[PDB]
């Protein structure tokens, strides 16, 4: 058969979700962004394409902050990255409200992962067109 790539959450005969891979294609077409885990922390870096010199320098920030200890950078559709960061901020807020301590990095990672994966379960929603490098320092380093 054919037509497997037209709808989201549809398995192809080889067991793939082609809409997710097209989202990955959209990601690869984005600007470069990297993260480096060091001995006692993390560093995030991103390239911002200066399309013209009419862009105000040092503005148009791409790196976003979650809570006060999590840093997130993304490549792909910037609006989808902002959406994912907002969801993660809500997750971190609820975690702090219930459990008092700021959300650990693995917990936050699983929150974001469950959100993104849920966006690949239904044909009524589009997969996320971003790849996200995030992290920070918690009680475990």
């Amino acid at each position: 058969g054919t037509g497997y790539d037209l709808s989201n959450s549809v398995f192809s005969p080889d067991g793939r979700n082609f809409q997710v891979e097209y989202a990955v294609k959209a990601v690869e077409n984005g600007t470069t962004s990297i993260g480096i885990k060091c001995n006692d922390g993390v560093v995030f870096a991103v390239e911002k394409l200066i399309t013209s010199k009419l862009l105000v320098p040092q503005k148009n920030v791409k790196i976003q902050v979650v809570d006060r200890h999590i840093g997130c950078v993304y490549s792909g559709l910037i609006p989808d990255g902002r959406h994912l960061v907002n969801r993660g901020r809500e997750e971190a807020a609820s975690f702090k409200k219930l459990y008092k301590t700021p959300i650990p990095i693995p917990a936050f990672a699983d929150r974001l992962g469950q959100y993104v994966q849920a966006h690949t379960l239904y044909n009524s929603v589009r997969p996320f067109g971003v790849s996200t490098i995030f992290g920070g320092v918690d009680k475990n380093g």
Binding site: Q58, K59, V61, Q64, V65, D67, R68, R89, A93, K96, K97
Partner: protein, 233 residues
């Protein structure tokens, strides 16, 4: 909150030529029981604002969490969060007052009286009061509970009108605040000897004095009081 349980008493504050000063005793009373000592009731918001809270301590901790999350959310996507777009005292107070009036209008009030003190970005002093009813007002001197009956007379002796603010040095204001705290310890049954004080000045930083104690207590004349009228020995 439909009835307060663990409560905190007076919070007092006054303006002076360069800024504001605010004090509150470190006591959480459980009815008539001075149960919890060492309860910080002055919450610095950043480096230019201090919120003094009186009343239900659980609602005070709720307000603390709200202020923390407000600072956090102000930091989001805001490179000037440490500069031009930092949280101002007027912003924090208007948020608190909106919350208090909404809770009052839902018949579920935050059983507190709040004094937001600080210095604006333009150096202007901010000193305003909101309570569980949503009533808001500002004055050169502000006080909650018993302070509003006893501390305010002593503080208005120092700063009676707006014109007296530029004439009020920080030494005079701090001395007045400490004397008012001593008077409150004298005549308030739900007050503590230990208190905390906070000075927010436009020229220096935020100074947060903890573990202060009421001193210079006049009790000697009590040895000469005998009986309740006719007792001679």
């Amino acid at each position: 909150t439909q009835q307060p349980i663990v409560t905190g008493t007076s919070v007092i504050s006054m303006k002076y030529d360069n800024g504001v000063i605010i004090a509150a005793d470190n006591l959480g009373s459980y009815g008539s029981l001075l149960r919890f000592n060492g309860v910080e009731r002055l919450i610095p918001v950043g480096d230019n604002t201090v919120v003094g809270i009186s009343g239900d301590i659980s609602d005070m901790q709720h307000i603390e969490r709200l202020l923390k999350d407000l600072v956090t959310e102000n930091a989001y996507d805001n490179p000037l969060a440490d500069a031009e777009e930092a949280l101002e005292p007027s912003y924090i107070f208007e948020y608190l007052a909106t919350v208090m009036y909404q809770r009052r209008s839902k018949m579920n009030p935050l059983w507190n009286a709040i004094i937001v003190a600080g210095v604006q970005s333009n150096g202007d002093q901010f000193l305003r009061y909101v309570n569980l009813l949503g009533v808001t007002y500002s004055s050169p001197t502000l006080a909650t509970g018993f302070g509003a009956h006893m501390a305010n007379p002593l503080l208005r002796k120092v700063v009676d009108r707006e014109s007296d603010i530029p004439k009020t040095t920080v030494q005079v204001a701090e001395e007045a605040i400490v004397n008012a705290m001593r008077v409150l310890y004298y005549r308030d049954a739900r007050s503590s000897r230990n208190f905390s004080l906070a000075i927010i000045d436009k020229n220096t930083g935020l100074t947060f004095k903890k573990n202060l104690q009421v001193e210079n207590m006049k009790w000697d004349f009590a040895k000469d009081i005998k009986g309740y009228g006719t007792q001679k020995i």
